[PDB]
């Protein structure tokens, strides 16, 4: 069970970053839609994955 605790803390942590790079993504482009701009993210996060 014990072991099973670290596993969720990992799935926790992760759905949280992905909820979100998913959130830097919708609604950013949601704006766009109306007319605004969100983006040099990526450049952030893209170079971050690099």
């Amino acid at each position: 069970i014990q072991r099973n605790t670290l596993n969720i803390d990992k799935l926790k942590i992760e759905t949280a970053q992905e909820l979100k790079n998913a959130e830097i993504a919708l609604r950013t482009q949601k704006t766009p839609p109306g007319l605004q701009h969100e983006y040099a993210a990526p450049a952030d996060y893209f170079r971050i994955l690099v």
Partner: protein
């Protein structure tokens, strides 16, 4: 209640449209002006010195 969210998000979003609308509307026309009056003032100095 869920008639309900159909409308409120709708009136809210209707409003974001106007927000976009203003966003669409933005200045260069304005920036132009100071340059010109700064310029016309100078020609006037010419004519005066002439």
């Amino acid at each position: 209640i869920c008639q309900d969210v159909e409308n409120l998000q709708k009136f809210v979003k209707e409003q974001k449209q106007v927000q976009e609308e203003i966003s669409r509307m933005s200045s260069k026309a304005m920036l132009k002006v100071q340059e010109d009056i700064k310029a016309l003032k100078q020609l006037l100095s010419l004519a005066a010195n002439g």
